[PDB]
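Audit log entry. Action: structure prediction of a protein-small molecule complex. Ligand: zinc ion. The ligand was supplied as SMILES and no pocket hint was given, so placement is left entirely to the predictor. Protonation state taken as written. Sequence taken verbatim from the request; no trimming, no tag removal. Recorded inputs:
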Amino acid sequence: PFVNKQFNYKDPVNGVDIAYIKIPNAGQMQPVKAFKIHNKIWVIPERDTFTNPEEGDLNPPPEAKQVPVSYYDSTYLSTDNEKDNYLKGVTKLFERIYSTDLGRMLLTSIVRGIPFWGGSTIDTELKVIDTNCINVIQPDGSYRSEELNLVIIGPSADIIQFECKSFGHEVLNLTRNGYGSTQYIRFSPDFTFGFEESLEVDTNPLLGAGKFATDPAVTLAHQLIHAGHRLYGIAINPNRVFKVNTNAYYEMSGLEVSFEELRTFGGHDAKFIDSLQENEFRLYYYNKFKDIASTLNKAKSIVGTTASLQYMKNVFKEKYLLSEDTSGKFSVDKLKFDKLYKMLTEIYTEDNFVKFFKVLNRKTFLNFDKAVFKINIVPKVNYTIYDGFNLRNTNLAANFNGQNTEINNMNFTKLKNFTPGHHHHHH
Ligand SMILES: [Zn+2]
């Protein structure tokens, strides 16, 4: 959310909001410098070769094996100067998101979305799950474990493959049982995608469609919406998909977009989602929340040194908006639940963010990107918190001229065209 202090990648470690950390994952990775820009939210301006053991390096696949919509450069984000621009880029997008009524609400929901303390084998004991924390390095080289909700980190080998990922449990499906888990969003504020479009009326495309660029704040908001679903454990299994056409057959080929995506993008694309199935999930998650309420009600002990049981129960009471009856027993407030669920699944959408931002964006999640563009959003003369690329009092404020890649050509440097025309990428 709003970032109170101005961080520089150079600033010294203070073990509080600027430190070296290790991600709770697998091998003996070497620490990396990280910045806590808001309660529970961290930014690691490094390439992600930690979240997945199958991606320990930045070696690009052979050319013949590369997806049409992909971009590789083992060198991006490897110098302090890039990291510093990464950090300020991400921070500025958070402020742009936070600056809208919709984004302020989403970020508030994300910060209150502490992953549940369901890591004990004893059913009456609350204990944090290790993969929902990071190890902050102390002055004396020792590691101090800290809980967090979100981490913004650089992309893996393919630079434009953005996504929201998290560590799993050996038996619990944290993203789908109402528990939630720390979310790691692979993202870069240094590149954006170009698309075609041009809102017209009846008869006139002599010059062809305009060539525009996607505002990075929308691309980040998209990932954060996924994070919202997952922090609250109400994500939908990606194998659950819906066919999106006409003239096509099922089997889930031709065109079947996952339920998760259609709901995240929203707008005209959220009408292809089966209402009943949608209704079933809300009931299923409402129940998951009820189970959590009983777990809290039956809790007799807690693991950890600083936090007291009552303290944690209250943390979760605020998260899941539970009712605390006349006897102290927690219950799921149907009124408050419905609202929370609705907000998380249908108010927080890419479509709605596009409205608040007043930007041009693909109309249907089913649009095709044409190219990748190098950009630099840090300079206030290139991009602002309130206008993005369509700077006011310049010829960039009308007709999304700021997003137009021909007009505002000094703000977009093409790195590659996506040769085939047909498929997707995603998010
Ligand atoms: Zn998505």
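Audit: result stored. The helical segments are 80-98, 101-112, 216-231, 259-265, 275-297, 309-319, 334-347, 350-357. Residues 222, 226, 261, 264, 427 surround zinc ion (CB under 6 Å).
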